[PDB]
């Protein structure tokens, strides 16, 4: 009938009836093929497209309280007709909106889903050139940033048609620091972007060899070739790291951008695919303080912040790592708050997710969730989410990962 | 052919060829039916038993460097013969040892598996009364404790035969604090043992209504009825919590037992089942400091330790929880060290697991691992394990969970 789910903290039980609407032991795999929707060089076979199309249309119309039956049956018809004549179909603006929030709502790895319904949608389905793509992206960044009071938004570019005419942002995220190697062997900046940074250079980008050099937007439009554009500095707002007690913190010269916008995901809805549709929320402290700043494959500042705190950085058992990282997190949080830039700590984040999750079950008997992702990189069991049992399942609409575009691309020149 | 596994920190890749020897999306489920081996009231059907028996015998003999072919073929015969005559068979002591270490080695949720080969085995297959069971358990506790220098060990009781003659320790762990309700509504001691504590009372136990009252051993032998025995206080060694800087820590009057011994798991080997075989390792700081001491469904001391540290325990964004829990962990570690009682911090734990894991892959192309379990309840991404991808799979031998014995038990009186 369904599946019981226990919350080992409050002891409460839940019944997941929603997992039945899924699709089709890989525990800690980052990019499983099950979560990726790759390239195709032929349209989406009519027999496949039509059913998904109807389902989605029945979902949309089956969502409002005062159900408009006429419009529903009518739309269904107009839809199938459009499919019979052109092949693929076009969603109403209202539908696309509904599609983008559901896809978010249905994102197993997102902690900030309580906000699902509060999203801004930028309809860029008219776009046709990289230059126009770049202009929309700027409008996005400018809107989302809002002088620190971050606003969630998504810009939808033209849906995949035949397959050779895909719109694709080659970047992982909109704003993202560059990572250069160095003569003395040491890596500089974000070591994770080493590969993509090189690529930007190959595409004729001028590497200002620094620690926080905002990478260039590498845009591809209508299956064309990738054109490079530098993000207008006036658009990239950044916060300067500063500890509320350690005056030596600013001496670390750290800072991070305020905009967390995922750029390379595909939106799947009603059997239609949107290879390019960047979106953004706002940061959760631990993302910067723990991942970005502390990971040994990123800025890796833990040992540096350690000794300056005067700790036995050579005795693991002293828990210096535990103390240090926490002070970094304090810095990140303090700084975003001080410089009036929206941000949320992970504890608060979790409590809001738990609240969210309840609403999801009451409202629709389920809520897809990846525990491995949903639990904060620090102070795990201290947050409620650690204790919540949860089922992970790919519903629809959905935001899938895509194969890295440079790997598969018919190059023009 | 196999499965690539990436370690997102060192970037290194691994090939898991071992998952092929497994048996047969449930992400964060604690007690999945896939990990439980329940009751049965009929022997283990010969056609099932014989194949598993041979496999195991081929495993055992296929483990030594200087392979003794004669003894091998010979054993195989003697084995099948014993099966044809009696039904179930008896493992050689050497085999049982090999069986208990492999089962450990094959434990997906154990962080301390680098020690797998270093285990003490107590052969209590001769046991036949609760009184004798209790005596062996004491020998165990006494051996393992070793005046603070903890030693890993396991005591194997008689294997399941027909099913109505099962040997079973009703406790979750050997040493374990009691949890009583209270007139004023407040819970006292370990709130997790509320159920089992009551049971002990029903079985005529004298509840000394305290915070750290070591529960009674509830033993069941040869399908008999559960008899209660109090653990001799001289046997239960405990450490007194004490912070190396905050003199007010001891004023908290906290303490914890040094022996972490899992009591209720079933050992499966060569198709034979051992419903009772408690084992023990030594603690990993976070287990006590974070789980036992901080969980809102245990001792829950986080807020108490908070205000005494002088923190804004009413402003979540202050990260007081992060600071507090860490100091508790410092206390737990400091105290076990000071009172000369073996213990290992989680950071050190992780590095040793990573080392372990390498050996496992090089030595046998695989290593079953539950990331959700293997990653520390605090400072997740700070430890290497967080970044390691890993496959979870039930091999054999194996330590399965069992259905709670009180739920399914043909009561005599
Ligand atoms: C409003 C505040 C939001 C917060 C606090 C939030 C927070 C997070 C966090 C912590 C993650 C994991 C990030 C990582 O470790 O890489 C995440 C992932 C994700 N979020 Fe949300 N998010 C927000 C808004 C959004 C919005 C508006 C969308 C989309 C419309 C979204 C879609 C997703 C997706 C698809 C992932 C997974 C990304 C991946 O697989 O790498 N998020 N978010
Ligand atoms: C020598 C030191 C050892 C350490 C540091 C260690 C540590 C751990 C930790 C941290 C867990 C998770 C505990 C929890 O959250 O409940 C665990 C689980 C486990 N360990 Fe090990 N362990 C050790 C020895 C052993 C031995 C000797 C065996 C068995 C022969 C063993 C069998 C297991 C099993 C079956 C689990 C899973 C228990 C469950 O599912 O609740 N451990 N151990
Ligand atoms: C729901 C979730 O699986 C559960 O609360 C967890 C997660 N991982 C764990 N990890 C360890 N070490 N111990 C546990 O009890 C749990 N429980
Ligand atoms: C191997 C493991 O899945 C990986 O390193 C993880 C785990 N969970 C995560 N959780 C978040 N939030 N972000 C991540 O990148 C990861 N990566
Ligand atoms: O907008 N997002 O997709 C997104 C992704 C990751 C994080 C982390 N903090 N905030 C985020 C928002
Ligand atoms: O012996 N064990 O099965 C076991 C189980 C859990 C823990 C936690 N620290 N040490 C342990 C040993």
UniProtKB/Swiss-Prot annotation, chains A, B:
<feature type="binding site">
    <location>
        <position position="401"/>
    </location>
    <ligand>
        <name>heme b</name>
    </ligand>
</feature>
<comment type="similarity">
    <text>Belongs to the NOS family.</text>
</comment>
<feature type="binding site">
    <location>
        <position position="28"/>
    </location>
    <ligand>
        <name>(6R)-L-erythro-5,6,7,8-tetrahydrobiopterin</name>
    </ligand>
</feature>
<feature type="binding site">
    <location>
        <position position="173"/>
    </location>
    <ligand>
        <name>L-arginine</name>
    </ligand>
</feature>
<comment type="subunit">
    <text>Homodimer. Interacts with NHERF1. Interacts with GAPDH. Interacts with S100A8 and S100A9 to form the iNOS-S100A8/9 transnitrosylase complex. Interacts with SPSB1, SPSB2 and SPSB4. Interacts with ELOC and CUL5 in the presence of SPSB1 or SPSB2 or SPSB4. Forms a complex with ASL, ASS1 and HSP90AA1; the complex regulates cell-autonomous L-arginine synthesis and citrulline recycling while channeling extracellular L-arginine to nitric oxide synthesis pathway.</text>
</comment>
<protein>
    <recommendedName>
        <fullName>Nitric oxide synthase, inducible</fullName>
    </recommendedName>
</protein>
<comment type="function">
    <text>Produces nitric oxide (NO) which is a messenger molecule with diverse functions throughout the body. In macrophages, NO mediates tumoricidal and bactericidal actions. Also has nitrosylase activity and mediates cysteine S-nitrosylation of cytoplasmic target proteins such PTGS2/COX2. As component of the iNOS-S100A8/9 transnitrosylase complex involved in the selective inflammatory stimulus-dependent S-nitrosylation of GAPDH implicated in regulation of the GAIT complex activity and probably multiple targets including ANXA5, EZR, MSN and VIM.</text>
</comment>
<feature type="binding site">
    <location>
        <position position="373"/>
    </location>
    <ligand>
        <name>(6R)-L-erythro-5,6,7,8-tetrahydrobiopterin</name>
    </ligand>
</feature>
<feature type="binding site">
    <location>
        <position position="283"/>
    </location>
    <ligand>
        <name>L-arginine</name>
    </ligand>
</feature>
<feature type="binding site">
    <location>
        <position position="372"/>
    </location>
    <ligand>
        <name>(6R)-L-erythro-5,6,7,8-tetrahydrobiopterin</name>
    </ligand>
</feature>
<feature type="binding site">
    <location>
        <position position="287"/>
    </location>
    <ligand>
        <name>L-arginine</name>
    </ligand>
</feature>
<feature type="binding site">
    <location>
        <position position="291"/>
    </location>
    <ligand>
        <name>(6R)-L-erythro-5,6,7,8-tetrahydrobiopterin</name>
    </ligand>
</feature>
<feature type="binding site">
    <location>
        <position position="25"/>
    </location>
    <ligand>
        <name>Zn(2+)</name>
    </ligand>
</feature>
<feature type="binding site">
    <location>
        <position position="282"/>
    </location>
    <ligand>
        <name>L-arginine</name>
    </ligand>
</feature>
<feature type="binding site">
    <location>
        <position position="386"/>
    </location>
    <ligand>
        <name>(6R)-L-erythro-5,6,7,8-tetrahydrobiopterin</name>
    </ligand>
</feature>
<feature type="binding site" description="axial binding residue">
    <location>
        <position position="110"/>
    </location>
    <ligand>
        <name>heme b</name>
    </ligand>
</feature>
